mmCIF file of C-alpha atoms in Angstrom:
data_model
loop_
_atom_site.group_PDB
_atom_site.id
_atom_site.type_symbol
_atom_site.label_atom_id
_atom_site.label_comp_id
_atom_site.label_asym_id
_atom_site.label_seq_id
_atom_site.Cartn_x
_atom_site.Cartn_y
_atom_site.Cartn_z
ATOM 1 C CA UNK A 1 0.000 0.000 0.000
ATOM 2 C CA UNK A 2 0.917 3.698 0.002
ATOM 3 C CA UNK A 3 0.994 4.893 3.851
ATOM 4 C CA UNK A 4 3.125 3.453 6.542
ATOM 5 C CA UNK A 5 2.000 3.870 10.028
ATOM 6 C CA UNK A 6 5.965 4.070 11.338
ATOM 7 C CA UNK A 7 6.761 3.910 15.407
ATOM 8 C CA UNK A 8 9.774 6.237 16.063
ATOM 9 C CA UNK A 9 11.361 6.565 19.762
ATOM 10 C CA UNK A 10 9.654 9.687 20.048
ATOM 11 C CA UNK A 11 10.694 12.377 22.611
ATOM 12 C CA UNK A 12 8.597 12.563 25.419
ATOM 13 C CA UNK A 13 6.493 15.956 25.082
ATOM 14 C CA UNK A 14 4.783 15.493 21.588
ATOM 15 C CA UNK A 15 2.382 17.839 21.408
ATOM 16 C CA UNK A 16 1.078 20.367 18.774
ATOM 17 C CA UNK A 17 1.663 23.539 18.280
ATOM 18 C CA UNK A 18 -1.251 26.516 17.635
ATOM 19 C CA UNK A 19 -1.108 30.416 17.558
ATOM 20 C CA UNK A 20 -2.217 32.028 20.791
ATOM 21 C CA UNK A 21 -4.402 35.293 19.497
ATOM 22 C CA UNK A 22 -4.157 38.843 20.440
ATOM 23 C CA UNK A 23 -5.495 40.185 23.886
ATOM 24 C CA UNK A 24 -6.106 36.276 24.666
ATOM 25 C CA UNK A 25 -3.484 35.412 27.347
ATOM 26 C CA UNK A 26 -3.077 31.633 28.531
ATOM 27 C CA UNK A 27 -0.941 29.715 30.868
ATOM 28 C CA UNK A 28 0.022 25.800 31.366
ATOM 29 C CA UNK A 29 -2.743 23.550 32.600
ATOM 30 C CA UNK A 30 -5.726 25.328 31.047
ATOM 31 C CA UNK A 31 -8.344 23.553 28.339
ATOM 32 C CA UNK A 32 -8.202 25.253 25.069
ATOM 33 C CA UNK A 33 -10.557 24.798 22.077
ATOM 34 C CA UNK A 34 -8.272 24.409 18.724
ATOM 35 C CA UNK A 35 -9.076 23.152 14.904
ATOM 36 C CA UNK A 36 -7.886 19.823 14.226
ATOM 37 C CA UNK A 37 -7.066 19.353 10.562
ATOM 38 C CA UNK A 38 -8.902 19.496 7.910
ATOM 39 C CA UNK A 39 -12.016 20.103 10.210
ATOM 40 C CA UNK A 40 -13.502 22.272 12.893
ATOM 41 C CA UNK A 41 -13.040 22.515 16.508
ATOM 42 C CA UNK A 42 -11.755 19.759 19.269
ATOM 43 C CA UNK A 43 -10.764 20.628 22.897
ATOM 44 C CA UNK A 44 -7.070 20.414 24.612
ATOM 45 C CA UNK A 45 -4.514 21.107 27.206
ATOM 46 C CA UNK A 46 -1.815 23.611 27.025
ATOM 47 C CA UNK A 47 1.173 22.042 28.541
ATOM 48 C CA UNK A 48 3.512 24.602 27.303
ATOM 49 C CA UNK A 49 3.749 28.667 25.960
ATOM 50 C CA UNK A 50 6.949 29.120 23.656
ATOM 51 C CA UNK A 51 7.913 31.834 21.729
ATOM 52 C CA UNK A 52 8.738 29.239 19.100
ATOM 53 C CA UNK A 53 7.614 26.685 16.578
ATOM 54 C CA UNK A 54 9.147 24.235 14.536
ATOM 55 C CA UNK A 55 7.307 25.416 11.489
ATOM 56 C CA UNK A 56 6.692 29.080 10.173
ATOM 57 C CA UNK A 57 4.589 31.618 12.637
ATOM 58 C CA UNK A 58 2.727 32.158 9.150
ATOM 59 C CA UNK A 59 1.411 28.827 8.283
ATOM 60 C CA UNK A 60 0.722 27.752 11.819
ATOM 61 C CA UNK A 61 -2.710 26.578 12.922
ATOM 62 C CA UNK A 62 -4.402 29.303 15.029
ATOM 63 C CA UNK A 63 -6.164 29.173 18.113
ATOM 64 C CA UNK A 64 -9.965 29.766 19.157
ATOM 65 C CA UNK A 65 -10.832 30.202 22.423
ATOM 66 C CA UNK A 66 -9.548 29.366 26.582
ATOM 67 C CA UNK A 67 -12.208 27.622 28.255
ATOM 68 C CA UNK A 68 -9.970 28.314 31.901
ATOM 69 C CA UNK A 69 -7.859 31.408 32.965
ATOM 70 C CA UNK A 70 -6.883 29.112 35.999
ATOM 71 C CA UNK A 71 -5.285 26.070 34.809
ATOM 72 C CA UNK A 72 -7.621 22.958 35.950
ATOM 73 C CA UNK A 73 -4.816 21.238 37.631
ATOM 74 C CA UNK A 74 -2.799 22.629 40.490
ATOM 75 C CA UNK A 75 1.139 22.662 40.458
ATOM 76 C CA UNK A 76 0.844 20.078 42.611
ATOM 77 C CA UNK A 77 -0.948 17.876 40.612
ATOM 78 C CA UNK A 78 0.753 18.975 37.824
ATOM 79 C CA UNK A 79 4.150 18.063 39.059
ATOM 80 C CA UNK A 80 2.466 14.845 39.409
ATOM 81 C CA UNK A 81 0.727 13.785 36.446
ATOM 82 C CA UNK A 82 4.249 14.836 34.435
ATOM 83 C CA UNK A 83 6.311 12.949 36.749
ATOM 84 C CA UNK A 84 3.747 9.979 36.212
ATOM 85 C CA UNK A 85 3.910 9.754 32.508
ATOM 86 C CA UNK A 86 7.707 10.212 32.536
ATOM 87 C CA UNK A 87 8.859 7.850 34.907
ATOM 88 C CA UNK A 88 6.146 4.817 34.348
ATOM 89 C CA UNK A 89 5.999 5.959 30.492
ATOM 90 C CA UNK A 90 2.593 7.164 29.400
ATOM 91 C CA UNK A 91 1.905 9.819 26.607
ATOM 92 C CA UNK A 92 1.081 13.213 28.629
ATOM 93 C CA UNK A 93 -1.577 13.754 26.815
ATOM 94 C CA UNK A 94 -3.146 10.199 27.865
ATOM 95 C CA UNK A 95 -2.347 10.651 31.737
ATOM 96 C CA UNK A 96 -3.454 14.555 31.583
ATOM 97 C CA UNK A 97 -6.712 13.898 29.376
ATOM 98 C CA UNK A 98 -7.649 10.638 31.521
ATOM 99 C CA UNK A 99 -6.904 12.227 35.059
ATOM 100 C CA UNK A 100 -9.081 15.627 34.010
ATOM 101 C CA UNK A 101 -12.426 13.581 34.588
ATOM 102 C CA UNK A 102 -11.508 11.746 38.284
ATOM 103 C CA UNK A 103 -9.937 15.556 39.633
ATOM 104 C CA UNK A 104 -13.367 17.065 38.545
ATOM 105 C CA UNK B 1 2.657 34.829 23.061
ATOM 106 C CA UNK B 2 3.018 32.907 19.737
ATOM 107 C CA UNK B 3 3.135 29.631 20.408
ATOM 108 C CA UNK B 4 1.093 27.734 22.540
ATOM 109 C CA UNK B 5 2.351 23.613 22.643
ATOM 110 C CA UNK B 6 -1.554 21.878 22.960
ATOM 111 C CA UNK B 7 -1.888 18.348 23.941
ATOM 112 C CA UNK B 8 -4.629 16.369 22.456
ATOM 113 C CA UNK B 9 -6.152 13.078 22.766
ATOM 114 C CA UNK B 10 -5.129 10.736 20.010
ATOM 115 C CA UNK B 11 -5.402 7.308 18.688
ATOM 116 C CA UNK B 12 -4.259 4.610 20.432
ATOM 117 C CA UNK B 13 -0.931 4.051 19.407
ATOM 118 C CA UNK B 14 0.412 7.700 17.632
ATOM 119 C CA UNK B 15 2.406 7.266 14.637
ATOM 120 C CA UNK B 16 4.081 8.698 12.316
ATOM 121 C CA UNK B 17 2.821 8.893 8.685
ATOM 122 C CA UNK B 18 5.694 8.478 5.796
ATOM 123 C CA UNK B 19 4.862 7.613 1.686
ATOM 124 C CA UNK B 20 6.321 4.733 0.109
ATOM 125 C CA UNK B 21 7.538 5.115 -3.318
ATOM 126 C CA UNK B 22 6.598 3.332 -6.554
ATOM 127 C CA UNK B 23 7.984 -0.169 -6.313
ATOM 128 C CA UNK B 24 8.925 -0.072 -2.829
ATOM 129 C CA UNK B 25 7.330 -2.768 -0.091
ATOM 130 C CA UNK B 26 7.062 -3.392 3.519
ATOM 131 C CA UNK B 27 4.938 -5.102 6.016
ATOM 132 C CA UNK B 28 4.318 -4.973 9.425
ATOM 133 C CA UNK B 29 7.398 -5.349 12.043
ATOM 134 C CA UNK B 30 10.046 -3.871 9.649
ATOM 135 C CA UNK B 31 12.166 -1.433 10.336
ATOM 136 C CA UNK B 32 12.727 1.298 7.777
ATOM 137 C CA UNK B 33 14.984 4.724 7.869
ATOM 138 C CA UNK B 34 12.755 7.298 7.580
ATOM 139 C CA UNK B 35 13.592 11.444 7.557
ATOM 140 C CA UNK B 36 13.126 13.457 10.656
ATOM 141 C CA UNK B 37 13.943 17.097 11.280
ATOM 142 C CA UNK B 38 14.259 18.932 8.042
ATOM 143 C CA UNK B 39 17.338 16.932 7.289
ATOM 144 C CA UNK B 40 17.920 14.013 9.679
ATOM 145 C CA UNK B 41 17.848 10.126 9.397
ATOM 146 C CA UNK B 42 16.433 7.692 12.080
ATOM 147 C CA UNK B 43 15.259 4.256 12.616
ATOM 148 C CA UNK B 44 11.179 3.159 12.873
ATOM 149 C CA UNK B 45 9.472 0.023 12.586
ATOM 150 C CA UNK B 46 6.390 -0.227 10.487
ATOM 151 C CA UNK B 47 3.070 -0.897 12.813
ATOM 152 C CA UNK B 48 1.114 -0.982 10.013
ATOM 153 C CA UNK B 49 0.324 0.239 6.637
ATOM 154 C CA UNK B 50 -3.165 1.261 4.943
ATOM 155 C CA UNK B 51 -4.345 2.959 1.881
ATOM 156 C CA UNK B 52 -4.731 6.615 3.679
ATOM 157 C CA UNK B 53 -2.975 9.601 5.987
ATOM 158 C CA UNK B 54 -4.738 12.592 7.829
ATOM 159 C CA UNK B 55 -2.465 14.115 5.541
ATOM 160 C CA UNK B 56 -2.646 13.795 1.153
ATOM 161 C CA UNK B 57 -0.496 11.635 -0.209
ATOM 162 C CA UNK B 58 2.295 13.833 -1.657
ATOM 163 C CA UNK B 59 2.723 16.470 1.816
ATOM 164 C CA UNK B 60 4.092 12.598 3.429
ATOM 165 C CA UNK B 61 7.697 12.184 3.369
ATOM 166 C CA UNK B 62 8.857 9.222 1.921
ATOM 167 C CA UNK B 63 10.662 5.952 3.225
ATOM 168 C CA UNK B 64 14.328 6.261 2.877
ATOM 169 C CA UNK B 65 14.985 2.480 2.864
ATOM 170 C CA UNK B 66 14.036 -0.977 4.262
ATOM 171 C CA UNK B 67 16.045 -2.662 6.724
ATOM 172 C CA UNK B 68 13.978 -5.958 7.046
ATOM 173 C CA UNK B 69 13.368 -8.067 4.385
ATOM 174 C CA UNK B 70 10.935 -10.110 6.844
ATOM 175 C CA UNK B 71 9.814 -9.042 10.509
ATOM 176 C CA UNK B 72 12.446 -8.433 12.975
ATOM 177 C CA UNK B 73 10.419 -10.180 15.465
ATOM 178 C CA UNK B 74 8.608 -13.167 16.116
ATOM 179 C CA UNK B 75 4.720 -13.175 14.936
ATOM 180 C CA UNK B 76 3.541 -14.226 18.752
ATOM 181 C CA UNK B 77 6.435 -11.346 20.009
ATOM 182 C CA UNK B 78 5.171 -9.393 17.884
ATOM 183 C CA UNK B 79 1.365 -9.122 18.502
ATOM 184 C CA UNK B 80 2.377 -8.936 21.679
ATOM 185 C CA UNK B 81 4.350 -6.073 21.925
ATOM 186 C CA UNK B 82 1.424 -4.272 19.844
ATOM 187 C CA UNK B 83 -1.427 -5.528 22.510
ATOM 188 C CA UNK B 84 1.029 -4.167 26.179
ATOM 189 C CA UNK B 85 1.626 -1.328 24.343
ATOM 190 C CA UNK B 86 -2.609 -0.600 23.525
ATOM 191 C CA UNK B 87 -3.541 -2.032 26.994
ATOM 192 C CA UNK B 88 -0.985 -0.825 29.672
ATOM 193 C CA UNK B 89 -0.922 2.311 27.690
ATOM 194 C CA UNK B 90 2.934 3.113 26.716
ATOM 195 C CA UNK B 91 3.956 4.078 23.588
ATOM 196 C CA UNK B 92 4.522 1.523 20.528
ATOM 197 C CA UNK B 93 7.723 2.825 19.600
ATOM 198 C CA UNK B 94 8.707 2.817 23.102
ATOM 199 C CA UNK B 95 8.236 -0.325 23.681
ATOM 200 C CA UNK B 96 9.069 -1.602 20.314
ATOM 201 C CA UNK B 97 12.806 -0.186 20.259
ATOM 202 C CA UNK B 98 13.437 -1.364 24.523
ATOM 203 C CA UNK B 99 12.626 -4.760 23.578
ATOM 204 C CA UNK B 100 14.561 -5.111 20.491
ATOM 205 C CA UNK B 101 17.736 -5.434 22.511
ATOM 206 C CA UNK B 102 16.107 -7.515 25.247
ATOM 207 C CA UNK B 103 14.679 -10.047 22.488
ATOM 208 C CA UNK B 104 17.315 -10.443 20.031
ATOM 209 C CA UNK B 105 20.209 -10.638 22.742
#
């Protein structure tokens, strides 16, 4: 066939990357509602607010809205769920996505 | 302010997406050399491959080259590897590339 579905050793933080708007500040640990390809909307969490992206600041997927101005987790629980997927290996985005519902 | 790193939920086991030329053939448990950064090389193993990409066709980067003519694994291993990975949640590649060693030495 044409596609291959390849596994690489991955870093650990792979996450995607979307312009933050004007006026519309957001920190770490706060829901945010971004398009997801060739599509419309899907909710996520902001682990992380660079000042750069791998690709150009021109054709980079945009952002919508923040759903929290206080992130949802605390630093404590933050520290945690991080240290979790690192040292017992589980995709941040798993443990932080799967731990939102029991917090709440 | 410009870039905001967004984690979102995706499919089981997350992988990466890379064309295979005309004439060129793999299956499942391979390992192929595949391009990564806008000029590196690295190692993967194929997990799968289907007729279609989130992405068309001809934005995919291609396979550089096949390193298995069969499966570097065993078929049993293999399924295996693919069901702890899905169940106790840890990524394929990660596992895939820590057992290698473990299995084959």
């Amino acid at each position: 066939m044409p596609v291959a579905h390849v596994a690489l050793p991955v870093p650990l933080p792979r996450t995607f990357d979307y312009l933050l708007p004007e006026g519309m500040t957001v920190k770490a640990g706060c829901r945010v509602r971004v398009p997801f390809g060739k599509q419309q909307e899907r909710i996520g969490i902001v682990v992380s607010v660079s000042d750069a992206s791998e690709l150009p600041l021109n054709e980079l997927k945009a952002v919508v809205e923040v759903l929290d101005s206080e992130p949802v987790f605390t630093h404590s629980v933050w520290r945690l769920l991080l240290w979790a997927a690192d040292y017992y290996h589980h995709p941040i985005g798993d443990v932080l996505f799967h731990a939102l519902p029991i917090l709440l």
